[model samples]
Target: DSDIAFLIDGSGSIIPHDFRRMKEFVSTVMEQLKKSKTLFSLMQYSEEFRIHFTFKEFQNNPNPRSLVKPITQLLGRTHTATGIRKVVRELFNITNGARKNAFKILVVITDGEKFGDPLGYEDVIPEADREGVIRYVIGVGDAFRSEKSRQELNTIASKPPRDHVFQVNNFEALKTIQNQLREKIFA
Candidate 1:
């Protein structure tokens, strides 16, 4: 089974109203991938991070809605690198819940470039590569307009650029790009 982990940016920028919008986007995603039988794990991050669900659990759940509601809560300052680092330690390692033999995929969604950690992440890329984890960075909303977001997203993506990095001007555009995401990771 392929192991897919979604790192959602639940920062201040998402706002409550948009949180509801993101849920629909996820619904479209879940419905699209319903028959795939893959293991999925979702983690929402802002000032802190939390795992919303795992496909191991979602695979057979009678009702798989609320895919994004668990992250409808709030937080400020996008500690993105911190989120990545933590997921690496907790979910990407063999000793962790991840399957060492399965393809490991990490999708990170963020609105801004600055990760908010003064110390920053010293070895994020190295660890990701070392773990052999495939990553895709999705830049959402206006902050992605900044040269910073693109550079940061590029840094984390699994090379050849277009194959791993993507952006959407706003959540309204999410549905349009949702299938492309599924195609990239699933196919």
Candidate 2:
């Protein structure tokens, strides 16, 4: 079994329209993931971390209505790393105690710079890797596509194998992300 955790940025910088698109993207991914044994959890972050939903075992139902309902209700605004650390810690606890062979994954979707933590990756990325979790970062909208933001995310994503970091130049790129994630998870 594998667990996929979504770290969504509901911070002040993310507009309502972008949030809606993000929800749609997530729903689309859920629909495609129905065929696999991939469980998922939702975490929305701003200044702190909010768990929209816990790890729900994957179900391959063609109908996505039930899954989309919960996604529509999420709202927030804060720091990116705050929620990230919380979610990572939670996953680590689960891995250590369950004694399971599940592949742990953290998917961070954000639109702004990685602020709130001064030391950046030095403070967070090591802990995530130490827990045996593979991280996938998705930068959404133009806010995150700027040269500065791209450089920042790249620096934070400076671990081996550049495939871990992803950038979406616009909201439409999310459609491509759905297909890419499917291939990565299945492969």
Candidate 3:
């Protein structure tokens, strides 16, 4: 079994339609991945973070529509780096129900460019890596039109480029990536 967390950008920059598409994508994947013995957690953020649920909270509602309702209620600024740092530091820790010896992974889904030098990532990310935590970067939409955005995501993913980085044209296009993610988690 593995402990997985989906770190989502709840920023205002991502419109409702796009966010709904993302929720749908995740909802679809969760149903599949759950059967592969993976426990799930979701942390949504903008300037700050919100734990919509933790690994042990899965049965609160197995229905995707139920979870999407709470997730769709979020909106704020794009503090991407800050949000990542928070998830790395708090969400994956034992207190939050991360399983011991289970593979720990982060699925970061974001549509906007980050706004800081991301120093917290510098300190926390490496520590997480040394501790065997894996990270995957999934960039979506026009927000990825810049070289900077690409660089940020590249740096965020776990070292192996092919296995850890994925790009989607838009939230609706996220479907193309579903199988790869399922395979990765199952493998």
Candidate 4:
């Protein structure tokens, strides 16, 4: 078993339809991983961060839809770096029910590059590495077509980008990666 957290991007760049699609993607993956007994946590971020649930809450009630269905988008600047730092520092800890024995995994889903973040990727990513958090970066939409955009995601993923980085054309395509992502997390 493992402890997994999804750090979502709910910035202005994503449309409401795609935001709902992202939530559904997360819920579906949670349902699929239910049998594996993986503990899950969720947080959404833009210029600010909102942790919707923690591992402990999921432990008590494993109903995926109930936990995810009501989340509203926080539309603002894409402070992706700051959001990542918050998840690494606040979400993945024992106080939040992160298990010491369970593998620590972080899946960061975003539509574009970091903008208006007080902190840089250099400051927080090293900390994630030192904490032994297995990181994955999923970049959706045409925004990632840029070389610099892909490089930003590469900086966030754990070593050997091929294993940890995923890209999809649109939020609707997130479901296409569900099975593969589930399999790798448990493997």
lDDT by residue for model 3 (1-187), tens? 7888888887887878888888888788877777446678888877777888777666445554566566753687766666667776777777777678888888889887776434545765677688787888899988786777787787778988578888888888899999998888677
TM-score of 2: 0.80
Runs off by more than 4 Å, candidate 2: 56-68, 71-78, 95-99, 117-119, 155-161
Better of 1 and 2 by TM-score: 1
All models: lDDT? 0.73, 0.66, 0.77, 0.89
- Scored against the true structure, residue 82 in model 2 reaches a CA lDDT of 56
lDDT value for model 2: 0.66
Candidate 1 lDDT tens digits, 1-187: 6777778777777877767667676666666665554566777788877877665555545244655555565568788777888777776655445666778788887777755665354567678778777898888888877775687778868886789988888877777688788898877
Q: In candidate 2, which residue pairs clash?
A: 11-77, 46-78, 46-79, 47-78
Q: Taking the tens digit of each residue's C-alpha lDDT, what string does model 4 give over 1-187?
A: 6888999999988999999999999999888887555789998999989999999998888888999999999999888888878888888888998887777899999998888899999999999998888988899999897778899989989988988999999999998899889887777
> What is the clash tally of candidate 1?
1
Lowest summed lDDT across 10 adjacent residues in model 2 is found at 56-65
Ranking by TM-score: 4, 3, 1, 2
Clashing residue pairs, backbone N/CA/C < 3 A, model 3: none
Q: What is the C-alpha RMSD of each candidate to the true structure, in Å?
A: 2.3, 3.4, 2.1, 1.1
Better of 1 and 3 by TM-score: 3
* Predicted model with the maximum TM-score: 4
Model 4 stretches with alpha carbons more than 4 Å out = none
